[PDB]
Tab-separated table of N, CA and C in Angstrom:
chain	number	residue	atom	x	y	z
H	208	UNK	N	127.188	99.141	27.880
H	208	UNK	CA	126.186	99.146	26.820
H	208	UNK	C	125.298	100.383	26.908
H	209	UNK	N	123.614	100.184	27.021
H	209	UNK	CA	122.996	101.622	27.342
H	209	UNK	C	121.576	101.113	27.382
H	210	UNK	N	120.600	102.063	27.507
H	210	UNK	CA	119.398	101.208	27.437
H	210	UNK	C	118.755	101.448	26.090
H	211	UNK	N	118.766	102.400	25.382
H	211	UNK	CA	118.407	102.931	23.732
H	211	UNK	C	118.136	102.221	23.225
H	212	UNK	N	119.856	101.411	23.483
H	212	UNK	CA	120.291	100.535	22.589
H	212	UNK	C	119.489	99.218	22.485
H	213	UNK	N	119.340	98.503	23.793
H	213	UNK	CA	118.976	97.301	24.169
H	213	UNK	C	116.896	97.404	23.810
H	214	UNK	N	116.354	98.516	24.065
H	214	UNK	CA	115.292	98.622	23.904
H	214	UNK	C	114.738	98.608	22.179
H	215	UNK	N	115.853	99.425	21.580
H	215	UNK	CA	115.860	99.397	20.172
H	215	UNK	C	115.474	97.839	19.391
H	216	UNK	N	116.949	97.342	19.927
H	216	UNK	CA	116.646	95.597	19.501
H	216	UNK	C	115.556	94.749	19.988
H	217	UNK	N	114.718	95.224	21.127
H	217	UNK	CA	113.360	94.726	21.835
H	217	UNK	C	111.960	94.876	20.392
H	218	UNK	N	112.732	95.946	20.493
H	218	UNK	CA	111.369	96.646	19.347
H	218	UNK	C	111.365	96.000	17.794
H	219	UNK	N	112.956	95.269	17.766
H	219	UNK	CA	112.629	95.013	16.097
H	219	UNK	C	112.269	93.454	16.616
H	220	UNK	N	112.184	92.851	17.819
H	220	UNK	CA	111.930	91.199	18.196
H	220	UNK	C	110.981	91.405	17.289
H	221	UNK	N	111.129	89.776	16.608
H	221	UNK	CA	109.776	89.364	15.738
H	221	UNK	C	108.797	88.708	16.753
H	222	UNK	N	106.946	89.157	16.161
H	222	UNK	CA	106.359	89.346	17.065
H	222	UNK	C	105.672	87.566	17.243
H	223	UNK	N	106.338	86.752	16.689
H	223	UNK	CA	105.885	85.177	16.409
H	223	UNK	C	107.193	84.871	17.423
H	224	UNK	N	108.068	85.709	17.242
H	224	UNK	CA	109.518	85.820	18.599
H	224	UNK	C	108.665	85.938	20.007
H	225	UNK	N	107.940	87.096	20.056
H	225	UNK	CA	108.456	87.506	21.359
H	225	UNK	C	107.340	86.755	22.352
H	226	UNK	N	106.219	85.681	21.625
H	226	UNK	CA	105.738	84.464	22.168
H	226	UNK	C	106.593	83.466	22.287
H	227	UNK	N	107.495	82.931	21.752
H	227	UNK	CA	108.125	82.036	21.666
H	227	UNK	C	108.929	81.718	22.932
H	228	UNK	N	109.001	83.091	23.675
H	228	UNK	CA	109.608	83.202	25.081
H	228	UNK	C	108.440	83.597	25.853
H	229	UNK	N	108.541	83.428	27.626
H	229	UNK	CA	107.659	83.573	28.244
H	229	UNK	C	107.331	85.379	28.790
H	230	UNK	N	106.905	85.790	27.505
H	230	UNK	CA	105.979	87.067	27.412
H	230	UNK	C	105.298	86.980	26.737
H	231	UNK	N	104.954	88.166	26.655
H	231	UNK	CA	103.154	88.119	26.603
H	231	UNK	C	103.005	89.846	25.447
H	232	UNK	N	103.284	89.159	24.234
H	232	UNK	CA	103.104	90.363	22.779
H	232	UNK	C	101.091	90.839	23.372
H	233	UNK	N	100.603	91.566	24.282
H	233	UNK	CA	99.732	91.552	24.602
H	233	UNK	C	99.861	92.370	25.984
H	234	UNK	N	100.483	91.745	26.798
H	234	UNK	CA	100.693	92.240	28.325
H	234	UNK	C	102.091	93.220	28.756
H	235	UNK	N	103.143	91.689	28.611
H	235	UNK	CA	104.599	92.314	29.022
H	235	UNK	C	104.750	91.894	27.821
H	236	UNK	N	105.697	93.090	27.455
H	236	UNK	CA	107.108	93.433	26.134
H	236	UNK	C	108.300	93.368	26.753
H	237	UNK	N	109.359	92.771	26.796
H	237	UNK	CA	110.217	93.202	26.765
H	237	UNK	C	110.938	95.164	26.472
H	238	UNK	N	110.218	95.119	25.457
H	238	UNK	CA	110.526	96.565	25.112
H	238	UNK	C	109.878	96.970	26.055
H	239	UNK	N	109.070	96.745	27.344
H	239	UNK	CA	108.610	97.207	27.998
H	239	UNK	C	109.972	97.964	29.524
H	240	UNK	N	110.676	96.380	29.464
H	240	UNK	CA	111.219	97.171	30.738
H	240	UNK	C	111.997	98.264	30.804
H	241	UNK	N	112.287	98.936	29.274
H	241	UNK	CA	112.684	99.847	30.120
H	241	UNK	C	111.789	100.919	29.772
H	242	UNK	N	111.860	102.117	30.948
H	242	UNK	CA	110.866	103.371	30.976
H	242	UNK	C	111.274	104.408	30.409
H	243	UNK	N	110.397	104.956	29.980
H	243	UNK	CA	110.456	106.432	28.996
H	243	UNK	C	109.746	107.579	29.358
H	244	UNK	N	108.251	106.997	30.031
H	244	UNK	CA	107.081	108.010	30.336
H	244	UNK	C	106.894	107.826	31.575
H	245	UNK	N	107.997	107.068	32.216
H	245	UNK	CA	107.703	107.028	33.835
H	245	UNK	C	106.274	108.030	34.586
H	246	UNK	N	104.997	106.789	35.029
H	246	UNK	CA	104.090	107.286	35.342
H	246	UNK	C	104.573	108.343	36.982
H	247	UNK	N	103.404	108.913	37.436
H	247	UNK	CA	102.831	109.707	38.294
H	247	UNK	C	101.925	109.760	39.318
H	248	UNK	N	101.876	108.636	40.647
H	248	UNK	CA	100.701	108.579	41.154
H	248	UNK	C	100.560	109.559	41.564
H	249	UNK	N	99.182	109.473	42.016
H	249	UNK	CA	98.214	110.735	42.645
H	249	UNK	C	98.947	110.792	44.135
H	250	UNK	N	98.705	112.268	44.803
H	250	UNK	CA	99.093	112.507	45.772
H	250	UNK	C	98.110	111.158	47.095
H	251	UNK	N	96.848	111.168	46.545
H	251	UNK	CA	95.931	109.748	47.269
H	251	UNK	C	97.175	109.057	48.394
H	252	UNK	N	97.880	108.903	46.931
H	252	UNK	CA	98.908	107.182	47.291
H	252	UNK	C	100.368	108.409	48.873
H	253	UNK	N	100.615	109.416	48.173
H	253	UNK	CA	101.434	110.002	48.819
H	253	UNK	C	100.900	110.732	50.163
H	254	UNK	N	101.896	111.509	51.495
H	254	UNK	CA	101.415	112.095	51.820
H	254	UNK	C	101.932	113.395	52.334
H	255	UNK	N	101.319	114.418	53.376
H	255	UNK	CA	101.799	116.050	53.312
H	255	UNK	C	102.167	116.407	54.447
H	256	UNK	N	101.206	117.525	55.069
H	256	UNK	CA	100.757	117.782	56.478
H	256	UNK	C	101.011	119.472	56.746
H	257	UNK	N	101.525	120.095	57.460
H	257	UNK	CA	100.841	121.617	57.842
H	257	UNK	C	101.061	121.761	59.182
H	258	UNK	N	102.043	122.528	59.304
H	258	UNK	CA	102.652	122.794	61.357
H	258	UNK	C	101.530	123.884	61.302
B	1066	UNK	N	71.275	85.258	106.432
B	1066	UNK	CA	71.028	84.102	107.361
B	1066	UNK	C	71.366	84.845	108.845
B	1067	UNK	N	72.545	84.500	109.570
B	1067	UNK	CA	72.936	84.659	110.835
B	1067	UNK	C	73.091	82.962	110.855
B	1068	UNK	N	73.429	82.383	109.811
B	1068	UNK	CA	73.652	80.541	110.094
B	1068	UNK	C	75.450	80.770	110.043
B	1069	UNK	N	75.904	80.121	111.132
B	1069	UNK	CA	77.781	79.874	110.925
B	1069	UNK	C	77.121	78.989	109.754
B	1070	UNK	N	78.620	79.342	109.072
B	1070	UNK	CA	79.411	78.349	107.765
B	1070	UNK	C	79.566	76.796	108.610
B	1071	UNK	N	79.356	76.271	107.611
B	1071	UNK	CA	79.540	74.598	108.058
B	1071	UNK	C	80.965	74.840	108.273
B	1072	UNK	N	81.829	75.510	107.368
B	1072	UNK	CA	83.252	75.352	107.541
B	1072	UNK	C	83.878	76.659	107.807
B	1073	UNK	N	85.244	76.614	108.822
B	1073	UNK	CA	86.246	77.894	109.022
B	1073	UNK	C	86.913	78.444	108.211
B	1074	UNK	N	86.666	79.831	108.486
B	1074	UNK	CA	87.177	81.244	107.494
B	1074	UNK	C	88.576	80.681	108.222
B	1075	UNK	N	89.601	81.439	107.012
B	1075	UNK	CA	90.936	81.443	107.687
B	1075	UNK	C	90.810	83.146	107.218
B	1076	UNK	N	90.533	83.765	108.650
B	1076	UNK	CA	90.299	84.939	108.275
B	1076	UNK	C	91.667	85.579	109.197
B	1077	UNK	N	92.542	86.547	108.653
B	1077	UNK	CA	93.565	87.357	108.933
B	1077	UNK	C	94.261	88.264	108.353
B	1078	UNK	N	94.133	89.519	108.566
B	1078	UNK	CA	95.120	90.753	107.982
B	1078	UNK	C	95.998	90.066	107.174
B	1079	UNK	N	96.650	91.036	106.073
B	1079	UNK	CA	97.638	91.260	105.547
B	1079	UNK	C	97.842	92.650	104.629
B	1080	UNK	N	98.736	92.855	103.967
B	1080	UNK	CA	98.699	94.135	103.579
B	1080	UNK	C	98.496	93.874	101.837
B	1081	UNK	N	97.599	94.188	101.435
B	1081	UNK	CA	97.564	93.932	99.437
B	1081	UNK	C	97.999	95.424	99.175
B	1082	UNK	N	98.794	95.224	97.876
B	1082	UNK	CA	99.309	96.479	97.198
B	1082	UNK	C	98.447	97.047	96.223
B	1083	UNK	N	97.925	98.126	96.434
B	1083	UNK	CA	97.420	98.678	95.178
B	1083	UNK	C	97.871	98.686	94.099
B	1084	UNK	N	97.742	97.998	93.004
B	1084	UNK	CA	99.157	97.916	91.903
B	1084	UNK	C	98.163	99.289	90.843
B	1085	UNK	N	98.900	99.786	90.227
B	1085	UNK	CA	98.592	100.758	88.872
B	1085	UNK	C	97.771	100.523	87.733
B	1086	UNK	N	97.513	100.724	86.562
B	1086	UNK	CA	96.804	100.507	85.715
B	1086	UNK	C	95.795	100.116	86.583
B	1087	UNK	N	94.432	101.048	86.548
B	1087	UNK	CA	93.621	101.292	86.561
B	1087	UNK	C	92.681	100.603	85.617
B	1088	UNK	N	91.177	100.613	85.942
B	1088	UNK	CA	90.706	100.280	84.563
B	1088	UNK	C	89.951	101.198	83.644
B	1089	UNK	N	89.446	102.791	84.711
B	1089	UNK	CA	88.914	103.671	83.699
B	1089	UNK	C	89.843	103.812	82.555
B	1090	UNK	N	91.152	103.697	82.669
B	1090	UNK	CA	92.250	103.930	81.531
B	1090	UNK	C	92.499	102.995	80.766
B	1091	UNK	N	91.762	102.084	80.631
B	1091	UNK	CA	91.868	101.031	80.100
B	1091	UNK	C	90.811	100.616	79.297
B	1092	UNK	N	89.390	100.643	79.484
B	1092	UNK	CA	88.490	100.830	78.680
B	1092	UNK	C	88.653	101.487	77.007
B	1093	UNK	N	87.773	100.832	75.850
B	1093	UNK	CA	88.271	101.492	74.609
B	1093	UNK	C	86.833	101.170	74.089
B	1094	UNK	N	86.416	101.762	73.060
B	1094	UNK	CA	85.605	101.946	72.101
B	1094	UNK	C	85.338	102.593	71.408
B	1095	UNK	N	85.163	102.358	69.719
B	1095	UNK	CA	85.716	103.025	68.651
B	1095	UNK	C	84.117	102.982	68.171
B	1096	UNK	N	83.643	103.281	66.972
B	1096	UNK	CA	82.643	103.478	66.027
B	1096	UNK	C	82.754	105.096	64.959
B	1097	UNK	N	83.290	104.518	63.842
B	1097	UNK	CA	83.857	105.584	63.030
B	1097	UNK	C	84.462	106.912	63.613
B	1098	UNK	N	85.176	106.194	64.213
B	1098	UNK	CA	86.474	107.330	64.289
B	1098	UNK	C	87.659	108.003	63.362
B	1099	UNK	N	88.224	108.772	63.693
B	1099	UNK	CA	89.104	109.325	62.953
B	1099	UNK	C	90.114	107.925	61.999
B	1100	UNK	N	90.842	108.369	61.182
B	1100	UNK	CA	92.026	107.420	60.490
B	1100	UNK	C	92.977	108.036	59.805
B	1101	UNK	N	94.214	107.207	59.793
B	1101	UNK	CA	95.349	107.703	59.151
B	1101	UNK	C	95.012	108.568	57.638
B	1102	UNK	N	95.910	109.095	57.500
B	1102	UNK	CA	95.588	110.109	55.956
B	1102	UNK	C	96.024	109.019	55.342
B	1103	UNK	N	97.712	108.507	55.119
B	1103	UNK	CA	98.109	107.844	54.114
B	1103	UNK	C	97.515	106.492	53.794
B	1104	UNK	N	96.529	105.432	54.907
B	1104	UNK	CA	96.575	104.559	54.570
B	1104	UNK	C	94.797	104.932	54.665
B	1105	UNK	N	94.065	105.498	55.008
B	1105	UNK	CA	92.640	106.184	55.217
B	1105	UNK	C	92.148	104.919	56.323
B	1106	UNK	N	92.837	103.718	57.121
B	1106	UNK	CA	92.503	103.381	57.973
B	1106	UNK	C	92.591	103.868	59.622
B	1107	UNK	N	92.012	103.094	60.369
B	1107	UNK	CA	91.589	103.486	61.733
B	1107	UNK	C	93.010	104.073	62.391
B	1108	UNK	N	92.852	105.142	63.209
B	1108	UNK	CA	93.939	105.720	63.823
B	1108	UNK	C	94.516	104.236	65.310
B	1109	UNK	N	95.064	104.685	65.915
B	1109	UNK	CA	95.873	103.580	67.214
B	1109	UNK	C	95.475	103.931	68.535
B	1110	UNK	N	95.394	103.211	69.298
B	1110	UNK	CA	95.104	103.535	70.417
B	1110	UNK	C	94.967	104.804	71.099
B	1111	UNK	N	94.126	104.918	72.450
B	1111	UNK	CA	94.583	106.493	72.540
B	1111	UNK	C	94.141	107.808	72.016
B	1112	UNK	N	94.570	109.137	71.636
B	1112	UNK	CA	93.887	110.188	70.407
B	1112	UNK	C	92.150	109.967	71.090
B	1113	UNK	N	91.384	109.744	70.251
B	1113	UNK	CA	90.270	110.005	70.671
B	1113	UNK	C	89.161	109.155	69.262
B	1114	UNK	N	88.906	108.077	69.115
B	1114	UNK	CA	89.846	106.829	70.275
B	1114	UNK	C	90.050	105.705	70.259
């Protein structure tokens, strides 16, 4: 299949639909799982160092 | 005193082993010391300190 595809049909769910199942038209989408803008934490979370 | 014990020492040589671990090396105390970068908590034993 692909994910385009599957996200495409997320997006036309009717939105009286996508309560009707246990999400949340508010919180989690379905059209949510899959990623597009994959975030970026701060280096904070990561780390470095220096011989 | 200089009073004997009501009761007898069982007093006699033997040889005790000095065993290792020490206790100056063993002593610890911290008050805002250094800490890890990644987690910004307290560093581990040891280091300084």
């Amino acid at each position: 299949l692909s994910p385009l595809e599957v996200h495409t049909i997320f997006t036309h769910i009717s939105s009286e639909d996508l309560a009707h199942l246990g999400l949340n038209e508010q919180y989690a989408r379905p059209d949510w799982m899959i990623i597009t803008v994959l975030p970026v934490p701060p280096p904070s979370v990561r780390p470095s160092i220096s011989v | 005193t200089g009073r004997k014990l009501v009761a007898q020492v069982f007093l006699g040589p033997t040889y005790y082993q000095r065993l290792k671990h020490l206790v100056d090396d063993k002593i610890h105390a911290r008050a805002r010391g250094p800490v890890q970068i990644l987690t910004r908590q307290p560093v581990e034993g040891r280091s300084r300190d």
